[PDB]
Amino acid sequence: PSWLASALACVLIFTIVVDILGNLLVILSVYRNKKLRNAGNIFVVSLAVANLVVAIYPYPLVLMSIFNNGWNFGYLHCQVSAFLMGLSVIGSIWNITGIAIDRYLYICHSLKYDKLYSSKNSLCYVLLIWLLTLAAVLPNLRAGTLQYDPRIYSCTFAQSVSSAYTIAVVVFHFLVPMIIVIFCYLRIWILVLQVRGIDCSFWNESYLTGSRDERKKSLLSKFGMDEGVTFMFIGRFDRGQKGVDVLLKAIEILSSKKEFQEMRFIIIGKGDPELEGWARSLEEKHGNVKVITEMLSREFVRELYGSVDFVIIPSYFEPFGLVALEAMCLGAIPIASAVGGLRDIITNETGILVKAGDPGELANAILKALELSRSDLSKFRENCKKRAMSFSKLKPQDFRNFVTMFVVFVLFAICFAPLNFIGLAVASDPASMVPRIPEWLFVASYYMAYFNSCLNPIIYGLLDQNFRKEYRRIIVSLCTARVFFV
Ligand SMILES: COc1ccc2[nH]c(-c3ccccc3)c(CCNC(C)=O)c2c1
């Protein structure tokens, strides 16, 4: 591996200079730019320090130790250069975990309130992380798991010294954050999609005509059944997806009760012809249950939302669930099973929540829904309308900062995924798998993780226009131009 030594010098040389100047601009830009000066980006400076620390002291020692092919400094230099690298890399996730949490709170808050989320505790909240990162890394001095490795020319955490410490490192300081940050950004993506796909000019009460009671008496008279509390299912028919099967079991459970007489059901959809035969059966047996097996226009569906009292959404899985939100626009109060999407949308004040896949709990919800007077429903419909209106409030917003912080996270995971994956293979049998693991894969896994300390400024430049507009200002002020009297 002759040239493979010289190459490893380049990678660090790049990494140290880019990290030094790059993350120096990131601190400057946040202090210098009023748009980037918000307290939510306190985490970005804390992260840019963590990146920037390992280029002042550790990577210099490791760069020299490549050209030496050996450690030529003290054991303290080895024990301390290793220690700062751990304060960095562990702090760099737990910062990134904070950012992912911060921006989840930012979206959820801005739905519920009309005065931007302030990130009020962020400086105080950073000091919890740097205690958490100092508490996790500090035990490795006394246990003696920090030692020089000749393959990577560096002093670092030896995985093979104790598999108790590696598995604890890998689970608690990679897999636990990885799960938190995926969960955060996934639930953000659902909400930003729910925002994207809600046509407010279509799903609007304006397009309807009279009062509600009159429009309902019309709709029910149009199907040939009397006045009553009306319920509506509208989703394709299937044994386990959108949940028409749970509804039909629930209607049979209700049919015997005295309170059934005061109910009206309007089932819409097409799919399993046996479930269509089961629904058509309940149509023939009871005149208060109507079943519509063909394709209705969204024009007409709008009116049904506008006319009925409740919309039943008994879905097993339902990732986005606009059907709930669209219906709330026109005062339809959803009774809907707790699912990702519906748990985000439906609050406990707007509509009713049910344990998914249960005829009895759905029936007792329909019974709970029934025991509700005309005056009591008015506020529910108001809350439903206010709730759907908050999703359209976010439609024109700039969502690019979510991408910039997510791309930070994605590139982090890529760099440290190998090192943590290897660290589990080492943990299985330290004696066996230190030689058995491919020797290039060990070297690559480490030098990506180092290279990650120069990547944050490069990403902020390309994706966030405020940072790029400030790199122009920061660079063109210091270096470019000066005073000059004519
Ligand atoms: C928790 O104690 C420490 C203590 C010091 C540490 N230094 C590094 C490291 C820094 C840059 C590139 C590669 C590894 C780790 C991270 C080591 N993680 C694994 C799975 O081996 C580290 C951990």
Numbering used by the authors: 23 to 218, 1001 to 1196, 228 to 321
Paste lines from the article.
Concurrent ligand exchange and crystallization is then initiated by overlaying a protein-laden LCP bolus with precipitant solution containing a large excess of the ligand of interest.
Melatonin receptor MT1 has recently been co-crystallized with several agonists, including two melatonin analogs as well as two drugs: the sleeping aid ramelteon and the atypical antidepressant agomelatine.
